[PDB]
Design a protein around this ligand. Structure first.
Ligand SMILES: N[C@@H](CCC(=O)O)C(=O)O
Lengths: 280, 285
């Protein structure tokens, strides 16, 4: 009861991967765990149904280890009110919002630790290193986020075409730090990572700016090893993914010690080899 | 209220320690950007040899961690006084007797000799059982320092994993690296080799690699990469075999701990931390 926790996640391969359940036997198998998704009946009603799906991936394996070590059970669900988390008219949506508004005891996923989120939720120790990286076709001459081609894009003719996936930690950082860059970039907003890689590969974008851990993975998997992150995977604004918990959560202490134990015992390295390797 | 007692440790480029001038002040110097180097007076033992008295003298302290302290104190509006850890160590928990005790900066923080550790202090499970760490102010890991020309592939090299007295390697006593090798049973062959050779300080180990008295030094990459960048007779080898971060250390009931972590996050996000890296860590090659 008090040991059985509502937990929220969000698909973002390879950290969280969602699969359809076998119509028979309506059971999740192999390395997967049950995860439900609220799906609307139509757009003229608030009626919806939870759909039973199956979840796996690097962060799901972390959750499994935490459940075993810290001794809790859980009911995992996928967020439908936004994505990772954005404050809109002073109200948090996404995984952060689910925790703030007490619909979830914790959020487990590719959830970036930053200052403004830490004002409304508690974060565990970082368990995956991340930050902001820049993906380009191999050889592209950009030094980093502070390259003038990004900071003063109209000082070049034609200007560099670059964008991010809006409404997450990367856009929030660029909006605050580089106002001119930010208002230029929004015309190149990408709906998601997969769209952005297509845009790069077909020459509609010159650079994609995004979460470092996801971008470095996508570079390792790129067909032909043509797309790279700059600086051999350099990271601006270094941070990590953290488990988000409600402020003052009684679970934070044991989650922190468990994650630190996993790192110190080498258990994290095997998860990295299992989920995050690629040819390039 | 009261000024905070800050404990730190000599560890270039995070903390440099130099004598005061004759008048008891710290010489005015300027960074590689031309800006003044911020220095603080830090007291610490005049004799650092083992088993010796630790009567103290004022000294000058500066570096990445001292710049970070100054920023934290300005942000959260506390005053402070800095001293160097009396026993020269970062901190491990050792059996005494069935008691255990913490040494190093860890022991000073838990005993009240310090109120905050500001140093390249590795966040790990063992220490977090007893103190509060901030979110990391630096992400790094472990690597291996050797003399230029020495070829070892990394942590899985047979000269490490099947050791003999023909190839000596070591780390710093009573450090997080000591803890790491003592903890993992799969590393016990290496741990037993290193226990015969571990050094009292990183500086002494690095000097011993230069003098060909130590063939490999296993230590923090943030430190070893800096050393290699300045001393071209030294190189790192094998790339990071473990990843870990440095955090500010406080007692679990410190009133400052929430805002210390928020300030660290803010500094990563607005480029302050990267400016410190440009000033102190990467600028040579
Ligand atoms: N991990 C990011 C999402 C991707 C990004 O914006 O870089 C977040 O938690 O907001």
């Amino acid at each position: 009861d008090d040991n059985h926790l509502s937990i929220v996640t969000l698909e973002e391969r390879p950290f969280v991967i969602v699969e359809d359940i076998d119509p028979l036997t309506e059971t999740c198998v192999r390395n997967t765990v049950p995860c439900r998704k609220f799906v609307k009946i139509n757009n003229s009603t608030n009626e919806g149904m939870n759909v039973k799906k199956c979840c796996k991936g690097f962060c799901i394996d972390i959750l499994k280890k935490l459940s075993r070590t810290v001794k809790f059970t859980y009911d995992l669900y996928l967020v439908t009110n936004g994505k990772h988390g954005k404050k809109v008219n002073n109200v948090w949506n996404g995984m952060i919002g689910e925790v703030v508004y007490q619909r979830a005891v914790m959020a487990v996923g590719s959830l970036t630790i930053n200052e403004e989120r830490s004002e409304v939720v508690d974060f565990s120790v970082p368990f995956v290193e991340t930050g902001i990286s820049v993906m380009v076709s191999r050889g592209t001459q950009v030094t980093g986020l502070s390259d003038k081609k990004f900071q003063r894009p109209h000082d070049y003719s034609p200007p560099f075409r670059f964008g991010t996936v809006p409404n997450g930690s990367t856009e929030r950082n660029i909006r605050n730090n580089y106002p001119y860059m930010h208002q230029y970039m929004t015309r190149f907003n990408q709906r998601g990572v997969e769209d952005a890689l297509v845009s790069l590969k077909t020459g509609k974008l010159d650079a994609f700016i995004y979460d470092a851990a996801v971008l470095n993975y996508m570079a390792r998997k790129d067909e032909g090893c043509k797309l790279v992150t700059i600086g051999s995977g350099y990271i601006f604004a270094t941070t990590g993914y953290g488990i988000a918990l409600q402020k003052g959560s009684p679970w934070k202490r044991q989650i922190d010690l468990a994650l630190l134990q996993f790192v110190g015992d080498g258990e994290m390295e095997e998860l990295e080899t299992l989920w995050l390797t690629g040819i390039c | 209220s009261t000024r905070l007692k800050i404990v730190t440790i000599h560890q270039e480029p995070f903390v440099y320690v130099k004598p005061t001038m004759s008048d008891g002040t710290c010489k005015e110097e300027f960074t590689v950007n031309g800006d003044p180097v911020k220095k603080v007076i830090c007291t610490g033992p005049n004799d650092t040899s083992p088993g010796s008295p630790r009567h103290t003298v004022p000294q000058c302290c500066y570096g990445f961690c001292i710049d970070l302290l100054i920023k934290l104190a300005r942000t959260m509006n506390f005053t402070y006084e800095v001293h160097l850890v009396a026993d020269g160590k970062f901190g491990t928990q050792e059996r005494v007797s069935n008691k255990k005790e913490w040494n190093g900066m860890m022991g000073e923080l838990l005993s009240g000799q310090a109120d905050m550790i500001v140093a390249p202090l590795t966040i790990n499970n063992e220490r977090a059982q007893y103190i509060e760490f901030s979110k990391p102010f630096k992400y790094q890991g472990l690597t291996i320092l050797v003399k230029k020309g020495t070829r070892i592939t990394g942590i899985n090299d047979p000269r490490l994993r099947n050791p003999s007295d023909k190839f000596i390697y070591a780390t710093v006593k009573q450090s997080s690296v000591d803890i790491y090798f003592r903890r993992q049973v799969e590393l016990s062959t290496m741990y037993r080799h290193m226990e015969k050779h571990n050094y009292e300080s990183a500086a002494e180990a690095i000097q011993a690699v230069r003098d060909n008295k130590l063939h490999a030094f296993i230590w923090d990459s943030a430190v070893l990469e800096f050393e290699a960048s300045q001393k071209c007779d030294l190189v790192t080898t094998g790339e990071l075999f473990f990843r870990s971060g440095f955090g500010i250390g406080m007692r679990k009931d410190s009133p400052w701990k929430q805002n210390v972590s928020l300030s660290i996050l803010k500094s990563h996000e607005n480029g302050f931390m990267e400016d410190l890296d440009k000033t102190w860590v990467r600028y040579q090659e």
